[PDB]
Amino acid sequence: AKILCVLYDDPITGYPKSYARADVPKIDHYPGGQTAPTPKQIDFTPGELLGSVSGELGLRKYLEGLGHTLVVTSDKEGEDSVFERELPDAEIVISQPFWPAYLTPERIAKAKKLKLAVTAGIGSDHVDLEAAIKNGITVAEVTYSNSISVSEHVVMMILSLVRNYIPSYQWVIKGGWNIADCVERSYDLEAMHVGTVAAGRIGLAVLKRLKPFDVKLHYFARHRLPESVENELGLTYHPSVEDMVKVCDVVTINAPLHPGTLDLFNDELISKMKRGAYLVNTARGKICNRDAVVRALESGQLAGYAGDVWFPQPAPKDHPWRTMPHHGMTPHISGTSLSAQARYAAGTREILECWFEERPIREEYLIVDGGKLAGTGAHSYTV
Amino acid sequence: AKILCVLYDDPITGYPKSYARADVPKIDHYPGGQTAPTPKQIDFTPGELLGSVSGELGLRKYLEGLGHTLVVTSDKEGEDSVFERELPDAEIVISQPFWPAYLTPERIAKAKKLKLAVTAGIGSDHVDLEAAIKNGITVAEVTYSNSISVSEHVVMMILSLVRNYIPSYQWVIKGGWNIADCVERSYDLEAMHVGTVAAGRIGLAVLKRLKPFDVKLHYFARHRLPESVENELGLTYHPSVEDMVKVCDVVTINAPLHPGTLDLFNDELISKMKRGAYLVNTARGKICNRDAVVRALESGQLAGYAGDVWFPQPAPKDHPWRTMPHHGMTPHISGTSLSAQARYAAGTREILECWFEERPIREEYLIVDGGKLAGTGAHSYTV
Ligand SMILES: NC(=O)c1ccc[n+]([C@@H]2O[C@H](COP(=O)([O-])OP(=O)(O)OC[C@H]3O[C@@H](n4cnc5c(N)ncnc54)[C@H](OP(=O)(O)O)[C@@H]3O)[C@@H](O)[C@H]2O)c1
Numbered sequence: 001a002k003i004l005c006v007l008y009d010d011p012i013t014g015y016p017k018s019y020a021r022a023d024v025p026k027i028d029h030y031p032g033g034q035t036a037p038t039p040k041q042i043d044f045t046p047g048e049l050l051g052s053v054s055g056e057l058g059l060r061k062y063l064e065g066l067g068h069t070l071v072v073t074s075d076k077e078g079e080d081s082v083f084e085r086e087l088p089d090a091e092i093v094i095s096q097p098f099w100p101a102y103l104t105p106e107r108i109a110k111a112k113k114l115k116l117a118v119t120a121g122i123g124s125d126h127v128d129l130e131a132a133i134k135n136g137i138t139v140a141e142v143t144y145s146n147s148i149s150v151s152e153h154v155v156m157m158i159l160s161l162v163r164n165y166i167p168s169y170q171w172v173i174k175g176g177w178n179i180a181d182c183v184e185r186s187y188d189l190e191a192m193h194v195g196t197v198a199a200g201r202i203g204l205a206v207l208k209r210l211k212p213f214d215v216k217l218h219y220f221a222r223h224r225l226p227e228s229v230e231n232e233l234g235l236t237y238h239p240s241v242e243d244m245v246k247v248c249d250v251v252t253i254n255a256p257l258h259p260g261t262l263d264l265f266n267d268e269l270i271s272k273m274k275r276g277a278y279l280v281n282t283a284r285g286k287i288c289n290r291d292a293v294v295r296a297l298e299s300g301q302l303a304g305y306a307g308d309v310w311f312p313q314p315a316p317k318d319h320p321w322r323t324m325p326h327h328g329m330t331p332h333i334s335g336t337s338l339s340a341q342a343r344y345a346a347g348t349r350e351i352l353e354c355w356f357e358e359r360p361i362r363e364e365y366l367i368v369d370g371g372k373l374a375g376t377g378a379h380s381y382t383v
Numbered sequence: 384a385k386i387l388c389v390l391y392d393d394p395i396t397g398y399p400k401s402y403a404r405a406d407v408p409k410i411d412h413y414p415g416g417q418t419a420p421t422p423k424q425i426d427f428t429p430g431e432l433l434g435s436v437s438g439e440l441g442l443r444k445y446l447e448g449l450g451h452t453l454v455v456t457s458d459k460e461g462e463d464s465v466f467e468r469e470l471p472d473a474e475i476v477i478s479q480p481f482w483p484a485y486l487t488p489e490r491i492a493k494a495k496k497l498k499l500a501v502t503a504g505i506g507s508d509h510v511d512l513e514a515a516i517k518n519g520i521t522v523a524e525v526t527y528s529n530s531i532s533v534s535e536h537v538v539m540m541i542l543s544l545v546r547n548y549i550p551s552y553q554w555v556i557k558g559g560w561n562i563a564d565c566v567e568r569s570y571d572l573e574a575m576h577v578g579t580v581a582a583g584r585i586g587l588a589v590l591k592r593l594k595p596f597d598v599k600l601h602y603f604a605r606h607r608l609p610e611s612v613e614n615e616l617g618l619t620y621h622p623s624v625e626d627m628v629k630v631c632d633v634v635t636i637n638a639p640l641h642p643g644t645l646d647l648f649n650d651e652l653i654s655k656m657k658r659g660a661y662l663v664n665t666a667r668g669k670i671c672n673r674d675a676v677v678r679a680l681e682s683g684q685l686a687g688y689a690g691d692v693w694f695p696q697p698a699p700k701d702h703p704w705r706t707m708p709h710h711g712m713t714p715h716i717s718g719t720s721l722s723a724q725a726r727y728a729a730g731t732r733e734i735l736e737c738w739f740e741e742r743p744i745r746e747e748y749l750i751v752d753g754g755k756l757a758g759t760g761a762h763s764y765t766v
């Protein structure tokens with residue numbers, strides 16, 4: 001069979017010859033009990049670059065050893081690309097949210113042999129789940145593989161916005177000192193009200209990391225968390241997102257992208273936030289209305305916005321989020337740290353070993369199965 | 384009855400006429416029980432810029448009402464400055480560590496009327512304690528006033544170094560995407576070994592904030608924390624700093640500057656750290672040997688360095704910490720966030736009110752009193 005795998009490019013300085021450290025911590029389980037991926041073996045050392053074209057997610061020796069073909073490419077847009085040319089023959093498509101091979105209904109139509117679509121990572125919104133359902137296509141992602149990695153990115157970005165990190169760093173590069181310029185917009189996070197849109201694998205991990213900062217914790221979700229967990233953390237629940245953002249100094253978005261959350265943060269919901277609120281979105285770009293964020297930062301309604309997710313991906317050189325004021329953006333990198341890569345690459349292989357051995361894919365990896373939202377998809381997703 | 388106050392300059396864009404937010408949270412006491420400053424009143428709203436020349440720590444109206452004169456300037460370097468010209472006449476000298484009026488022995492001999500030296504902030508290493516001891520000069524500082532603010536700054540910088548935050552942000556501004564360039568040096572903090580030098584007010588707050596990141600926590604100190612505290616946080620105690628740094632992926636410095644800590648992180652100690660370790664120093668610049676940090680980064684013995692403290696302060700344009708590779712520095716700002724300012728300005732007034740009404744200054748504020756180390760100075764420094 002043919003496996004089509006879309007990865008981002010190697011560094012512009014070439015595939016790395018060395019890394020800054022010698023290894024990465026071994027991670028055996030996730031908070032709440034889910035085990036680390038269980039492939040029969042791995043053909044990489046955890047810590048190496050696996051998400052780029054030359055890394056190949058460490059799949060080539062295994063897949064070719066079973067006689068299948070593996071096409072790895074980064075070239076993913078247009079009828080002319082390696083991706084779309086090879087798509088009609090692929091039994092399996094793999095890509096990462098960081099450089100995603102969008103599986104629109106047109107591409108799924110052209111994909112005559114496509115049976116399995118794997119998200120090397122978390123969040124399968126780049127696949128058209130409705131069209132995947134109409135074609136008997138199993139959709140699967142490596143659940144939890146980088147949820148912790150994002151929570152660190154979230155707390156790092158909250159602190160950078162509130163304490164005014166990046167402009168102060170720029171004063172160091174500029175050769176200045178300029179204390180008053182740095183701190184005329186620099187605050188402590190302590191005793192601020194911080195709320196999260198969703199309290200899932202990421203959102204809960206964020207809430208735990210924020211607790212010893214002595215913030216006042218809030219959250220909004222379709223389902224309420226267990227009342228014990230609310231009490232051990234000091235949570236206040238809000239059945240309405242508008243209710244939360246009205247009392248919150250800082251807001252983190254940690255929900256998946258689907259019709260229920262698309263454009264959730266428009267000019268109207270943002271205009272309901274406290275003046276000078278901080279908004280962090282490591283979930284998906286479209287959950288925040290792009291020009292609304294830009295406008296609210298110009299007026300001082302938002303005192304800062306930071307995140308790593310954009311729309312589309314890659315973001316074009318002129319995308320207005322690059323130049324809007326008071327931001328702390330990165331590209332889509334939080335879920336593809338080298339530590340996270342070792343996990344979802346191992347999970348991708350685990351899914352592949354299950355597919356070619358006719359074993360069930362882990363119920364918690366499943367988003368679509370047999371023409372239905374299933375598994376995690378039934379519980380986190382809407383179509 | 385002359386008070387000599389050295390503060391940093393107003394912003395170059397002018398003293399602020401508005402702020403990004405309406406208020407700041409009311410900080411009530413510090414962890415462990417110490418009360419917030421208790422001046423009889425304050426002449427500012429918590430949240431205003433107090434540490435610049437126009438802020439005057441909010442002391443003019445108070446001090447002039449009592450018939451004293453308040454002289455405020457930022458000009459502080461050398462024999463030939465407003466500070467040294469006004470010194471022979473001042474009974475009280477106040478400065479902040481962020482823009483510090485060095486009370487060297489030579490200047491203390493000239494300060495013919497000086498009886499009180501107040502640190503508007505924490506850390507009085509800019510005052511030559513030995514000379515102040517000989518000349519019977521009381522030295523005080525607003526203990527705990529910004530310890531929590533620093534612990535936030537530390538966790539922010541740990542995450543930024545490890546996750547490669549700032550170079551990734553740069554790719555956003557340069558118009559790129561460059562996922563593999565961002566993440567070929569990007570790791571998760573989860574399950575790494577993190578150690579703190581000292582576990583006082585800052586170090587303990589650093590440790591509590593790190594605990595939910597699921598790191599393995601280490602600490603070195605001249606004296607052990609209580610067993611109950613070690614057990615609840617998961618700490619490993621090390622009797623020497625060499626013993627700690629050899630197993631630590633990340634090291635935070637949170638000890639005062641005094642003979643026991645001067646030049647502690649020199650070439651020899653740094654070469655005992657793990658290859659690719661991260662070093663964070665929000666304590667005082669001189670605890671790290673300046674050029675030893677640079678060489679260790681240039682060679683990759685340290686994967687990154689971050690801190691807000693320098694020697695001297697302000698740091699000159701050509702200071703090598705500005706241009707060394709893999710750094711995430713700020714100027715000396717963590718202790719002078721607007722939230723922190725409101726507390727040590729309140730506390731500075733409290734120390735002055737006690738002085739003028741002949742009531743004792745708080746024992747925990749005291750560093751030098753009655754010709755020897757006193758109060759906290761007896762506990763944390765040496766000479
Ligand atoms: N590199 C990155 O930046 C990165 C990495 C991984 C993931 N992500 C994004 O983050 C998303 C969540 O990650 P995760 O690990 O936490 O997955 P998860 O375990 O399924 O958590 C998602 C939670 O969102 C809740 N929620 C769902 N729909 C909602 C809605 N319409 N309104 C409010 N809340 C809603 C769901 O709970 P309820 O049913 O109780 O509402 C769910 O618990 C992912 O789907 C992905 O899009 C980004």
Ligand SMILES: NC(=O)c1ccc[n+]([C@@H]2O[C@H](COP(=O)([O-])OP(=O)(O)OC[C@H]3O[C@@H](n4cnc5c(N)ncnc54)[C@H](OP(=O)(O)O)[C@@H]3O)[C@@H](O)[C@H]2O)c1
Pocket residue numbers: 504505506507527529530533580581582583584585586603604605606607637638639640643644665666667691692715716717718719759762763764
């Ligand atoms: N804006 C900023 O960046 C900022 C702000 C505030 C403070 N600081 C710096 O951070 C320092 C500490 O602040 P803090 O609030 O935590 O004061 P603190 O409460 O007195 O804590 C200092 C601790 O250092 C310990 N220690 C002392 N000497 C040591 C040594 N030779 N080796 C190892 N550990 C030693 C002491 O404990 P043991 O007796 O057990 O050793 C003490 O508990 C301050 O002195 C200041 O220089 C920086």
